[PDB]
Amino acid sequence: EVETFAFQAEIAQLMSLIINTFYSNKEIFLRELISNSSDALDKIRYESLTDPSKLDSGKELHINLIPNKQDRTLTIVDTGIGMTKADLINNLGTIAKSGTKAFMEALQAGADISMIGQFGVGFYSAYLVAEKVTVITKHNDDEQYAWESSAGGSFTVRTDTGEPMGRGTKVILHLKEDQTEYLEERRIKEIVKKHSQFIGYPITLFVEK
């Protein structure tokens, strides 16, 4: 059972801008998603400070980067607080409508796309490099769900029957044909060292073969 939803008009306009604007500094997508992951790990850590059973779904707090050249996917896995179904609808737990508003006035006032994270909509920078994004998530208070969108004004949500996650979020980037450099080990290491050197959780870059 798959449910199809329309993006709010402002979010559709944000993704079309991300997709269509000429902007060469695409690598910032990884910084934004890792920062999103760190924020979600912060949230479950804070909750566990007064309720340790919140970590019964997993004590380890980490970020994994999993490239797969055969599938042409880069997957960012974290064991953060995760998202409810209601969170996935309602723009993956963001205040994306007001964030897009502020972002788009900043762009007309001199800002560039790299500053997207300052407006709380950094997730959508995934579409700098991805033709399709799948988000698998598990929150302690809900079941495991799969969100998916190839942009074009709509997204789907369905119950995820795949491999259980315990708790956290998995962002699967189905990369554009000309963006496969972000599957190369040395390129990912360079981006992580450049932009994510002060993330307070272990970031593990998986290798292939």
Ligand SMILES: CN1CCN(c2ccccc2CO)CC1
């Ligand atoms: C609500 N916060 C915004 C960033 N988040 C997010 C959104 C979509 C995909 C992945 C993530 C990170 O786990 C969760 C934390």
